[PDB]
């Protein structure tokens, strides 16, 4: 789903 | 030297395709079958997502001389049916769901309640092995799952989807987009691709771009999210 930018 | 400033295709970041898929399948089997599970801890953004999707999609259903129909939709990587419940079932007479994780499709029967009686087929299948039926769907909705397919599988899947569309039908991809290149998430075993890479894959599937929209009002810390309408 939505993911924190690496 | 040979090492480029960054990667721009999945073959540069996926070491072993078999393991890429098996690790992803294992990952999802272990996620709770809940909205917050589907959204990786962002359950609190679900309404923002759904309401924007509805506005994006309604234009195709309600406006123009060649409207998209409302008979049948396919929800791809549907999970427990978060999108099926709030976006698709209220707009389409019938919905099919496809997802690799059987337990999510099982939970969907509970999660969707009485309106779930209008979900017809629950296909338990990886998209990479799935062939949607020719001339079957007005809308094929693919959200938060394209990063789980390799470039070749995504291109071919989208091509099969094109053949599945009914007259005036569309495919929608709504997903995370990287600022630049192709980034591997080795925890859930997925990739995140930039806009150019996704555009190339769409083109390779023989699809045309009808609309492209960046999702507003999302958490500041997450990847940008774009919707593409295609046919
Ligand atoms: N190769 C694959 N084929 C089909 N589904 C896959 C897949 N890899 C992961 N998935 C599914 O992709 C989903 C990602 S979570 C997102 C669920 C839904 N699209 C929503 O937005 O609410 C999970 O349900 C998971 O089981």
CA–CA distance, B201 with B71 (Å, rounded to integer): 28
CA–CA distance, B143 with B183 (Å, rounded to integer): 18
Closest alpha carbon to B61 in B210, B226, B206: B210
Instruction: Mention every residue, 6+ apart, whose C-beta is less than 8 A from residue B55.
Output: none
Write the burial class of residue B18 (CB in 10 Å: 0-12 exposed, 13-18 middle, 19+ buried). Answer: exposed
Residue identified by tokens 């769409």 is: B202
Total count of residues recorded for chain B: 231
Write the burial class of residue B161 (CB in 10 Å: 0-12 exposed, 13-18 middle, 19+ buried). Answer: buried
CA–CA distance, B8 with B59 (Å, rounded to integer): 33
Instruction: Mention every residue, 6+ apart, whose C-beta is less than 8 A from residue B158.
Output: B171, B201, B202, B205, B207, B230
Helix (H) or strand (E) holding B202: helix B195-204
List residues in chain A touching B: CB distance below 8 A. 1-6
Helix (H) or strand (E) holding B23: helix B17-29
CA–CA distance, B158 with B207 (Å, rounded to integer): 8
**Ligand 1 in reach of B82 Cβ (< 6 A):** yes
Backbone angles phi, psi at B146, to 5 degrees: -65, -25
**Ligand 1 in reach of B145 Cβ (< 6 A):** yes
Instruction: Mention every residue, 6+ apart, whose C-beta is less than 8 A from residue B64.
Output: none
DSSP B112: T
H runs (alpha helix) in B92-176:
102-111, 151-164
Write the burial class of residue B221 (CB in 10 Å: 0-12 exposed, 13-18 middle, 19+ buried). Answer: exposed
H runs (alpha helix) in B147-194:
151-164
Structure tokens given for B123: 């296909």
| Resolution (Å) of this entry | 1.3
Structure tokens given for A2: 């939505």
Q: Distances from the Cα of B192 to the Cαs of B87, B111, B223, in angstroms?
A: 24, 29, 9
DSSP B63: S
Q: Distances from the Cα of B34 to the Cαs of B37, B92, B105, B112, B169, in angstroms?
A: 5, 23, 12, 12, 30
Helix (H) or strand (E) holding B199: helix B195-204
Which ligand 1 atom is nearest residue B143's CA? 19
Instruction: Mention every residue, 6+ apart, whose C-beta is less than 8 A from residue A6.
Output: B183, B185, B192
Q: Do B160 and B131 contact (CB within 8 A), yes or no?
A: yes
CA B172, B178, B181, B186: dihedral to nearest 10 degrees?
-100
H runs (alpha helix) in B30-150:
35-38, 46-62, 82-83, 102-111
Structure tokens given for B164: 């599945």
Instruction: For chain B, list the domains and their CATH numbers.
Output: 1-231 (3.40.50.150)
Q: How far is the CA of B4 from the centre of ligand 1 (A)?
A: 31
**Torsion sign, CA atoms B55, B169, B142, B180:** negative
């Amino acid at each position: 789903x939505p993911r924190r930018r690496s | 030297g040979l090492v480029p400033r960054g990667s721009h295709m999945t073959s540069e970041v996926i070491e072993d395709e078999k393991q890429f898929y098996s690790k992803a399948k294992t990952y999802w089997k272990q996620i709770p079958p809940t909205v917050d599970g589907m959204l990786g801890g962002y359950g609190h953004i679900s309404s923002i997502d759904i309401n924007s999707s509805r506005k994006f999609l309604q234009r195709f259903l309600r406006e123009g001389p060649n409207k998209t129909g409302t008979s049948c939709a396919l929800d791809c990587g549907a999970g427990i049916g978060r999108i099926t419940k709030r976006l698709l079932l209220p707009l389409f007479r019938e919905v099919d769901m496809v997802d690799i994780t059987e337990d999510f499709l099982v939970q969907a029967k509970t999660y969707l309640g009485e309106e779930g009686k209008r979900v017809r087929n629950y296909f338990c299948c990886g998209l990479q092995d799935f062939t949607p039926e020719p001339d079957s769907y007005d809308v094929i909705w693919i959200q938060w799952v394209i990063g789980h397919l390799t470039d070749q599988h995504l291109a071919e899947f989208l091509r099969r989807c094109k053949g599945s569309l009914r007259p005036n039908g569309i495919i929608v991809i709504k997903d995370n987009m990287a600022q630049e290149g192709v980034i591997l998430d080795d925890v859930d075993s997925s990739v995140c691709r930039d806009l150019d890479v996704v555009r190339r894959i769409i083109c390779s599937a023989g699809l045309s771009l009808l609309a492209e929209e960046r999702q507003e009002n999302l958490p500041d810390e997450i990847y940008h999210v774009y919707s593409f309408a295609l046919r």
